[PDB]
Amino acid sequence: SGFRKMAFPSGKVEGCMVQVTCGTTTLNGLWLDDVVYCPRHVICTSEDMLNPNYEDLLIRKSNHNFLVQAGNVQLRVIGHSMQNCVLKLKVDTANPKTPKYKFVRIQPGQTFSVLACYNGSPSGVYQCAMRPNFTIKGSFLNGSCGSVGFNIDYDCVSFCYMHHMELPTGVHAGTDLEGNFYGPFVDRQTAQAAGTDTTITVNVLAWLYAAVINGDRWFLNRFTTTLNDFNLVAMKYNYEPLTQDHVDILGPLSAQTGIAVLDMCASLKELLQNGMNGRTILGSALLEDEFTPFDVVRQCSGVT
Amino acid sequence: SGFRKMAFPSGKVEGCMVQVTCGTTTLNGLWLDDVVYCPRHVICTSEDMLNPNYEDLLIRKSNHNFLVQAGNVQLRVIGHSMQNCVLKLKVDTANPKTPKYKFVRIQPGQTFSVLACYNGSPSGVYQCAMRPNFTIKGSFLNGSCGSVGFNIDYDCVSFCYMHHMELPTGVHAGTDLEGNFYGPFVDRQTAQAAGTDTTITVNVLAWLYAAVINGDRWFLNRFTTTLNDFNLVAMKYNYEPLTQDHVDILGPLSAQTGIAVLDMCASLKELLQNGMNGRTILGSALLEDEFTPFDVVRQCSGVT
Ligand SMILES: *[C@](O)(C(N)=O)[C@H](CC1CCC1)NC(=O)[C@@H]1[C@@H]2[C@H](CN1C(=O)[C@@H](NC(=O)NC(C)(C)C)C(C)(C)C)C2(C)C
Ligand SMILES: *[C@](O)(C(N)=O)[C@H](CC1CCC1)NC(=O)[C@@H]1[C@@H]2[C@H](CN1C(=O)[C@@H](NC(=O)NC(C)(C)C)C(C)(C)C)C2(C)C
Numbered sequence: 001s002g003f004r005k006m007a008f009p010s011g012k013v014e015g016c017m018v019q020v021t022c023g024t025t026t027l028n029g030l031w032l033d034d035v036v037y038c039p040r041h042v043i044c045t046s047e048d049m050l051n052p053n054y055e056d057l058l059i060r061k062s063n064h065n066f067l068v069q070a071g072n073v074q075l076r077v078i079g080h081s082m083q084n085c086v087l088k089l090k091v092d093t094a095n096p097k098t099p100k101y102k103f104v105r106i107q108p109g110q111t112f113s114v115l116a117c118y119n120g121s122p123s124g125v126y127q128c129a130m131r132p133n134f135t136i137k138g139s140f141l142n143g144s145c146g147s148v149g150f151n152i153d154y155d156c157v158s159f160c161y162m163h164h165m166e167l168p169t170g171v172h173a174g175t176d177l178e179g180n181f182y183g184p185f186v187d188r189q190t191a192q193a194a195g196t197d198t199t200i201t202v203n204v205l206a207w208l209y210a211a212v213i214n215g216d217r218w219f220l221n222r223f224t225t226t227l228n229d230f231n232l233v234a235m236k237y238n239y240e241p242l243t244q245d246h247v248d249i250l251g252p253l254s255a256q257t258g259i260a261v262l263d264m265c266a267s268l269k270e271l272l273q274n275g276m277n278g279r280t281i282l283g284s285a286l287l288e289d290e291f292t293p294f295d296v297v298r299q300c301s302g303v304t
Numbered sequence: 305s306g307f308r309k310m311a312f313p314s315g316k317v318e319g320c321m322v323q324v325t326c327g328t329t330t331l332n333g334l335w336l337d338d339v340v341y342c343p344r345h346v347i348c349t350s351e352d353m354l355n356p357n358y359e360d361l362l363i364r365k366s367n368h369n370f371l372v373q374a375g376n377v378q379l380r381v382i383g384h385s386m387q388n389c390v391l392k393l394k395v396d397t398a399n400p401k402t403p404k405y406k407f408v409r410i411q412p413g414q415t416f417s418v419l420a421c422y423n424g425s426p427s428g429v430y431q432c433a434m435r436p437n438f439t440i441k442g443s444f445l446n447g448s449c450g451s452v453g454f455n456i457d458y459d460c461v462s463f464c465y466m467h468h469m470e471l472p473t474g475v476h477a478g479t480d481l482e483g484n485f486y487g488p489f490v491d492r493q494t495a496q497a498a499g500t501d502t503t504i505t506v507n508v509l510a511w512l513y514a515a516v517i518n519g520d521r522w523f524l525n526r527f528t529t530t531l532n533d534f535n536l537v538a539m540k541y542n543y544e545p546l547t548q549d550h551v552d553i554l555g556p557l558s559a560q561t562g563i564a565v566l567d568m569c570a571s572l573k574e575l576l577q578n579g580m581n582g583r584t585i586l587g588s589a590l591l592e593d594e595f596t597p598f599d600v601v602r603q604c605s606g607v608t
Contacts, residue, residue, distance in 0.1 A: 001474035004443040006428035009419060011315030115313060121608035124310035125429055137587065139308040141606040170305035170518055214474055275582075283441065285589030302445040304425035 003210050003282045005290070006299055007113035007125040008152040015097030018075070019120030020089070020146065021067035028117040028146030029068060029089070030159065030177070032098050036068050036075065036089040037177055038146045039164050040082050041187050049189040058082055069120060070095075084179030085164065085187050099157045103177035106160040108132045109200040109240070111292050112149040114161070119143060128161075129203070129290040132240060133195035134183025135171040138163070149174075167194050200289040201239040202246040205264055206296040207288045209253035211281045213300045218279060220259070223266040230265040237272045249293050256300070307514050307586045309594070310603055311417035311429040312456040319401030322379070323424030324393070324450065325371035332421040332450030333372060333393070334463065334481070336402050340372050340379065340393040341481055342450045343468050344386050345491050353493040362386055373424060374399075388483030389468065389491050403461045407481035410464040412436045413504040413544070415596050416453040418465070423447060432465075433507070433594040436544060437499035438487025439475040442467070453478075471498050504593040505543040506550040509568055510600040511592045513557035515585045517604045522583060524563070527570040534569040541576045553597050560604070 020029040020038040023045065029038035041049060043057050061080065066089050068075040079090030106112060108130050116124045116139060128136045128149060140147065140163055149161025164174045164187055171194060173185040185192055212220065231241045247261045254261055268287075276285060297303075324333040324342040327349065333342035345353060347361050365384065370393050372379040383394030410416060412434050420428045420443060432440045432453060444451065444467055453465025468478045468491055475498060477489040489496055516524065535545045551565045558565055572591075580589060601607075 001445075001470055002441060002443040002476065004430040004441075005309060006420065006430045006443060007311060009315075009318050009426035009429055010313045011318040011426075014313050014315040116310065118606050118608050122313035122315075123606060123608045124603070125313055126308040126310045137306060137308075139306040139310060139603055141305075141604075143606060166305055172306065278579075280590070283590075286584070286587075299428070299443055300445075302422050302427060302447060304422050304427045 001214055003214050003299060005127045006295075007127045008150065010113065010115045010122065010125040012099040012152065012157050013115045013148065013150055014122050015099070016095060017115065017117050017120050017122055019067075019069040021069070022061065022065055026119060027143065028120050030146070030148050030162070031068075031070060031075070031091070031095045032101055034091050034094045036091055037162065038087050038089070039162060039175075039187065040085050040087045040179070041145070041164070042087060051190070052188060054082060082179075085175050085181060086162065086177070086179030100155050101157045101159060104151075104158045104160050105176045105178075105180065106130050108134060109203060109292065111290060111295055112151055112160050114138055114149050114163075115147060116140065116144055117147045127290065127295075129200065130161075130182060131197050132200065133197040134181075135167060135173055135194045135197065136161070137170075138172040140166060140172055148177075167192065169194075196238070199237070199239045199287070201234055201242050202249060202293065203289040203291055204239070204268065204287050205242075205246075205250055205261065206253060206293040207282070207291045208264055208268065209250070209257055209259070209293075210291060210296045210300060212257045212259060213253075214282060216281050219267045219271055219281060220263075221267055221270050223270065224260070224263050225266045225269055226262070230262070230269055233269045233272055239272070252297050253293060305518055307518050307603060309431045310599075311431045312454065314417065314419045314426065314429040316403040316456065316461050317419045317452065317454055318426050319403070320399060321419065321421050321424050321426055323371075323373040325373070326365065326369055330423060331447065332424050334450070334452050334466070335372075335374060335379070335395070335399045336405055338395050338398045340395055341466065342391050342393070343466060343479075343491065344389050344391045344483070345449070345468070346391060355494070356492060358386060386483075389479050389485060390466065390481070390483030404459050405461045405463060408455075408462045408464050409480045409482075409484065410434050412438060413507060413596065415594060415599055416455055416464050418442055418453050418467075419451060420444065420448055421451045431594065431599075433504065434465075434486060435501050436504065437501040438485075438489075439471060439477055439498045439501065440465070441474075442476040444470060444476055452481075471496065473498075500542070503541070503543045503591070505538055505546050506553060506597065507593040507595055508543070508572065508591050509546075509550075509554055509565065510557060510597040511586070511595045512568055512572065513554070513561055513563070513597075514595060514600045514604060516561045516563060517557075518586060520585050523571045523575055523585060524567075525571055525574050527574065528564070528567050529570045529573055530566070534566070534573055537573045537576055543576070556601050557597060
């Protein structure tokens with residue numbers, strides 16, 4: 001029993017983290033086969049970051065300007081390109097610890113593990129959700145850039161996030177491993193707005209199922225509701241509208257609890273309308289939306 | 305910026321996890337040098353667990369009754385003993401992936417990372433606190449027994465916890481790596497009470513410092529207080545009494561925020577007396593006590 005925010009075990013990603021240095025900027029790189037991936041703003045001075053022309057800045061740089069270090073071992077750069085907002089540094093040495101891997105662009109509301117790194121050394125691992133507004137609420141200090149988000153499928157690491165920048169709330173924006181930002185952000189230090197951020201309704205339901213499975217049932221009331229009716233309560237409380245895809249995704253949890261999704265929506269409506277009256281659900285005094293149905297099924301039926 | 309419950313990177317511990325099988329019971333073992341450590345109740349049938357005589361039960365067992373598997377590799381057992389509530393299985397093969405390690409007994413209020421494992425395969429990693437009543441609030445399904453808690457100091461893994469049992473709230477009890485339970489618990493399926501559990505006051509203060517460092521300051525009020533005066537508010541709210549050791553431990557955070565500990569206590573008193581009035585601190589609608597000052601300094605000044 002018990003329900004915690006759990007990250008994937010990070011070992012397979014630890015073996016891929018390197019330090020990348022150009023001028024005095026140091027950040028983290030991801031070393032897979034004979035290619036090191038990092039944020040392209042590694043080539044910028046503090047001044048450059050205000051309005052950088054990355055093509056012109058990159059042109060001043062040659063292979064030998066890029067100090068790539070794996071532990072206490074210097075890799076030799078034999079090629080450099082920019083793909084969108086990532087630098088790819090081609091090295092002579094394939095990473096002998098390269099796991100089976102893929103690059104995936106994750107969808108809003110999906111979760112991933114972050115291996116927060118400094119100077120190419122892993123400090124810590126935690127679980128994050130891609131918010132509907134394509135930010136994450138991470139823990140990222142100066143040095144953390146190029147730290148990566150991932151999922152593990154069997155023995156296969158799916159890399160989905162590289163850390164680039166912090167936005168004015170203490171929220172985080174970054175790219176996929178092809179260097180495409182999640183959201184409207186650009187890698188320039190100028191005014192930029194994250195959208196209004198909605199609650200991942202299907203995640204909150206999954207978490208209420210998690211609460212039921214773990215014996216927290218108090219919020220389970222006498223009522224039911226309709227897709228139309230709940231989705232009207234959702235709109236008012238800045239929750240994302242629930243679809244039949246969502247109802248279908250909740251099937252395994254529904255079937256494990258013998259609680260119809262629409263009953264669970266009725267409980268949710270009453271929590272949104274009445275609040276929680278000083279009580280807790282899985283030790284939280286708030287509705288939690290950073291667990292996918294997948295994460296709940298994984299944790300509550302224990303897959304490796 | 306940002307503040308999250310972060311676990312140590314788990315790679316060094318992943319390489320130590322094995323599967324241990326006796327009769328039809330399977331759980332996790334920790335393989336260090338030529339010794340595999342697991343919970344001794346691996347030798348029990350469901351019936352045995354009610355009132356086991358571990359000495360007599362162990363006597364029915366020989367080296368060959370113990371199926372130790374590292375991935376798809378069977379280790380050969382050349383010795384077995386019981387130390388307190390752990391079995392030590394001596395194997396022919398030293399773990400080639402043995403990290404630099406120590407066994408430590410942690411104190412109440414200290415944190416550690418759990419690598420939750422099933423059939424000797426790591427599923428996930430999360431951060432836990434040894435509660436004042438020597439339980440933990442983990443995520444542990446059938447199969448999780450022998451999963452371990454640890455800290456990483458430099459390159460040195462300090463193992464501090466092995467998972468043994470679940471108590472009636474969905475709370476967890478286990479041993480150090482010498483097989484001594486934390487708390488009054490025994491490895492028998494019979495009525496057992498965890499003490500009343502107090503709040504780790506020094507941890508809550510560390511977390512309020514974390515909140516200030518990250519710009520959440522609203523709870524910072526005009527008042528101050530005394531050690532005696534706050535500790536009287538603490539007693540009433542089931543908080544552990546704050547000592548000068550605690551004030552001294554909060555020094556680095558005090559000095560980083562230029563906020564006197566006793567002012568921060570005054571804010572805490574008002575939160576305990578008035579509650580939070582529907583507001584949040586670092587995205588929590590509750591006072592968080594599972595971060596040590598150490599964890600706050602680590603995260604908020606980024607050590608690897
Ligand atoms: C990483 O590059 C790193 N070296 O680790 C770094 C992390 C942050 C945490 C403080 C430094 N990211 C940046 O430096 C990033 C690079 C410049 C400016 N960056 C920012 O993150 C800035 N954010 C920002 O200007 N946000 C908007 C665009 C105004 C909303 C900081 C003000 C936090 C430095 C670029 C290219 C975006
Ligand atoms: C591990 O052994 C394992 N195989 O992974 C297991 C984990 C729990 C989660 C369901 C099984 N632990 C036990 O089986 C443990 C072994 C027996 C009974 N155990 C319990 O955890 C029981 N708790 C319990 O009886 N608690 C008290 C003592 C009544 C407060 C369960 C009821 C949860 C099975 C022993 C030796 C304690």
